[PDB]
Design a protein around this ligand. Sequence first.
Ligand SMILES: Nc1ncnc2c1ncn2[C@@H]1O[C@H](COP(=O)(O)OP(=O)(O)NP(=O)(O)O)[C@@H](O)[C@H]1O
Length: 88
Amino acid sequence: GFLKLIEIENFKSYKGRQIIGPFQRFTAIIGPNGSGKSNLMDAISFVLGEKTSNLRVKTLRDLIHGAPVGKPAANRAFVSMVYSEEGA
DNA sequence: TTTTTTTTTTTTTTTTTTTTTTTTTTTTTTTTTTTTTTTTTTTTTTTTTTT
Ligand SMILES: Nc1ncnc2c1ncn2[C@@H]1O[C@H](COP(=O)(O)OP(=O)(O)NP(=O)(O)O)[C@@H](O)[C@H]1O
């Protein structure tokens, strides 16, 4: 199979629920500086698992959107992909 | 004009100092080990809350 698309919620400067579009065979993630694009990869490394120290943030509580600034939004987060393999 | 006297420059000798080079010794930062402590994370029971 391959990596179809993912799903974000409140994790690291992505407020609300929005669906990352379907991925073609070979895509790219462009954007100007400081826009916050590395954090999608951070999300990918968090669904598939990576020790927290490698996630360039201490304590795992400033993960929620807006916490490193000083004001959280909720007490949840939800990141999720949808793997699509042969067999329908 | 020639002879006699003075002074400056050039060059060699020497002596003291400086530099160099190696060698041997020493003592120091560097590198590795072990420990071990902290802190973050985890769990599980307790507590709180909801139907
Ligand atoms: N949970 C959060 N909520 C809101 N903002 C955040 C959060 N975490 C980090 N940020 C900020 O949002 C930005 C995201 O940083 P980061 O994801 O590293 O961006 P980037 O993708 O590396 N930028 P760039 O390479 O220049 O395109 C930075 O300014 C962070 O300080």
